[PDB]
Every structure is written in C-alpha cells, then in structure tokens.
Amino acid sequence: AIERTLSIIKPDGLEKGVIGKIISRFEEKGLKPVAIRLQHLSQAQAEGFYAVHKARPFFKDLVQFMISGPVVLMVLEGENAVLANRDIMGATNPAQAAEGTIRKDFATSIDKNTVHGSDSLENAKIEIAYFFRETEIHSYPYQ
Amino acid sequence: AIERTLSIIKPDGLEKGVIGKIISRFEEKGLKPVAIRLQHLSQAQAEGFYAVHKARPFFKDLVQFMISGPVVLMVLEGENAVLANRDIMGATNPAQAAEGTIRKDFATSIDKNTVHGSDSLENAKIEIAYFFRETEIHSYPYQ
Ligand SMILES: Nc1ncnc2c1ncn2[C@@H]1O[C@H](COP(=O)(O)OP(=O)(O)O)[C@@H](O)[C@H]1O
Numbered sequence: 001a002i003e004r005t006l007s008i009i010k011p012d013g014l015e016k017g018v019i020g021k022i023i024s025r026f027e028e029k030g031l032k033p034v035a036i037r038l039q040h041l042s043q044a045q046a047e048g049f050y051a052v053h054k055a056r057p058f059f060k061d062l063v064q065f066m067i068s069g070p071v072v073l074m075v076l077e078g079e080n081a082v083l084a085n086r087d088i089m090g091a092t093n094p095a096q097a098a099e100g101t102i103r104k105d106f107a108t109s110i111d112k113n114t115v116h117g118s119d120s121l122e123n124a125k126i127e128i129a130y131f132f133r134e135t136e137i138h139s140y141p142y143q
Numbered sequence: 144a145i146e147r148t149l150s151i152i153k154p155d156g157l158e159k160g161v162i163g164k165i166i167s168r169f170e171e172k173g174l175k176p177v178a179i180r181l182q183h184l185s186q187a188q189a190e191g192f193y194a195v196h197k198a199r200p201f202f203k204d205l206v207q208f209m210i211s212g213p214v215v216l217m218v219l220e221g222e223n224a225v226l227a228n229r230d231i232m233g234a235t236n237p238a239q240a241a242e243g244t245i246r247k248d249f250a251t252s253i254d255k256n257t258v259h260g261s262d263s264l265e266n267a268k269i270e271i272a273y274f275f276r277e278t279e280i281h282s283y284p285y286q
C-alpha cells in the first residue's frame with residue numbers, strides 16, 4: 001500500500017515564503033518527505049518533464065513559469081501516496097479547489113498554482129527517476 | 144548585513160515529522176531557505192564536518208547520531224543570518240533553551256537537539272561549501 005510520488009513546490013510557493021507550511025500539510029497527512037532538493041530548472045528540464053503537454057496551447061508559459069525561479073523537488077512516501085497527494089493539492093484551478101487544500105489556500109491562478117503532483121503510480125515512477133537517483137531517496141521511521 | 148548560513152535538521156527532526164514547522168520558523172523570521180537537500184550522511188562526511196570537535200568527548204556519539212538517519216541540509220539567507228539562526232535554534236541543552244525556540248519546542252536532549260547552525264561567518268562559508276556547490280544555491284524575491 002506504501003507508494004512514493006513526486007511533489008514539486010512551484011516558484012510561486014517559494015516567493016510566497018510558504019515552503020514550510022506546504023511541507024507540513026503533507027507531514028500532518030502522513031505523507032513522508034523521503035527526498036527533497038531545491039533546484040532551479042533549466043528550460044530543457046521543464047520541457048522534458050512537461051513533454052506530455054507539448055501539443056497543448058499554454059505549454060510555453062508553463063515552461064517559462066517553471067523556470068522563472070527555483071522550485072523544491074520532493075518525493076513523498078506513504079499508503080496510497082499518489083492519490084493522497086492529489087487530494088491535499090486540490091483542483092488545478094484554485095477557484096474550484098476544495099477547502100483546506102494547498103491550492104485553495106495558497107494558489108494564485110491556474111497558471112501559478114503552487115504545486116505539482118504525479119497523476120498516477122505509472123507517472124510517479126518516471127517523474128521520480130527524472131529528478132532523483134534511488135540513492136537520493138531515504139525513508140526513516142516516524143517516532 | 145545579509146548573510147548566508149548552514150542549517151541542518153538533525154535525524155530526530157525528521158522522525159518527529161516537523162521539517163515543515165522548522166522551515167516555517169525561519170521563513171517567518173526572515174531567514175530564506177536558498178538551498179535544501181535531504182541526505183543521509185556517511186561516517187566520513189559527519190566526521191569531516193564536525194572536525195572541530197574531534198578532540199571533544201562527545202565527538203564519537205555526535206557522529207553516530209548524525210549518521211543514524213537522514214538529515215535535511217539547508218542554507219539560510221537573511222539579515223544577520225548566522226546569529227539569527229542560532230537565536231531561533233535555542234540553547235544547546237534543551238533544558239536551558241528559551242521559550243519559542245526550535246530546541247525548547249522539539250529537542251529531547253543535548254545529544255539529540257534537532258538542529259545545527261553555523262557558529263560564525265567564517266565557518267558558515269566552510270560548512271556551506273562542504274555540502275553545496277554555488278550552483279545549488281538560489282536566492283529569489285519574496286512576496
Ligand atoms: N486547461 C488549462 N488551461 C491552462 N493551464 C492549464 C490547464 N490545465 C493545466 N494547466 C497548467 O499546466 C500545469 C501542469 O499541468 P498538470 O500536467 O496537470 O500538472 P500539475 O501537477 O502541475 O498541475 C497546471 O498545473 C496548470 O498550471
């Protein structure tokens with residue numbers, strides 16, 4: 001039941017100074033950060049990561065925003081982590097995000113929506129391998 | 144005035160699930176995390192890092208604790224960062240730690256005091272260069 005999923009705090013999250021608050025949201029929910037790395041993505045990295053949206057019309061802006069500032073890359077671990085993550089994140093459009101979700105509480109607009117999360121276990125594996133070596137991920141007990 | 148200093152959330156901080164809470168402490172006090180990386184230190188790394196304490200009787204234990212589990216390495220940037228960081232951390236001995244400090248709130252004992260902070264600017268340069276390439280540190284504008 002324990003899975004690992006990718007979480008990324010987008011540039012607006014760091015600029016709003018809410019890195020800690022966001023991380024706490026996961027921790028309080030049982031989503032254990034087992035890998036964390038603040039990094040400034042290059043255009044090549046963002047494009048390759050979001051390649052699935054190349055045919056889409058906002059892709060170019062998505063890429064620019066994703067490289068406008070540094071982000072915080074994280075791997076969350078827990079039971080049904082992929083889904084749990086999507087739940088706490090909330091809807092893509094902050095306006096439609098549920099109460100208490102990261103996006104409803106911190107997101108500005110649909111373009112600047114503070115966080116990213118793997119949409120599936122399949123994509124989680126890919127996204128995690130894109131940004132982390134297995135040797136960079138470390139689980140630990142909660143006690 | 145504006146300085147950069149090294150902060151490390153020791154193994155017990157992650158086990159207590161308070162990474163977010165600790166980071167928020169800094170963010171709200173004006174200490175901006177410009178570099179972050181969760182890592183499991185090796186014996187060689189912990190020893191080399193705490194070289195100044197090589198002749199102290201607690202050295203061997205400090206090293207063992209520091210490699211018992213992963214830690215979160217961070218570089219904080221802000222006004223009088225070196226001193227500011229330490230004030231927020233609190234006294235080495237949790238018993239003597241002031242109200243509202245990280246150690247009084249989260250530390251359990253002196254040999255498991257949750258956080259590390261560079262003790263001086265000269266040492267901050269050394270400690271930061273020990274764990275981070277200049278290319279891994281990224282400042283960004285706030286709100
Ligand atoms: N219909 C849309 N119109 C405009 N921008 C969108 C739309 N759908 C998605 N996006 C933007 O592209 C980003 C990436 O999409 P997605 O692949 O769903 O990842 P994510 O986890 O980052 O939300 C979204 O977070 C959002 O900013």
Ligand SMILES: Nc1ncnc2c1ncn2[C@@H]1O[C@H](COP(=O)(O)OP(=O)(O)O)[C@@H](O)[C@H]1O
Pocket residue numbers: 201205234235236253254255256258259260262
């Ligand atoms: N007298 C002591 N007895 C036991 N452990 C100690 C003692 N002094 C320091 N240490 C340990 O080694 C670390 C050394 O750091 P130090 O430079 O003494 O101050 P700090 O509290 O700012 O980290 C401490 O945080 C603590 O874990």
Ligand SMILES: [Mg+2]
Pocket residue numbers: 119
């Ligand atoms: Mg999608």
Ligand SMILES: [Mg+2]
Pocket residue numbers: 260261262
């Ligand atoms: Mg010290």
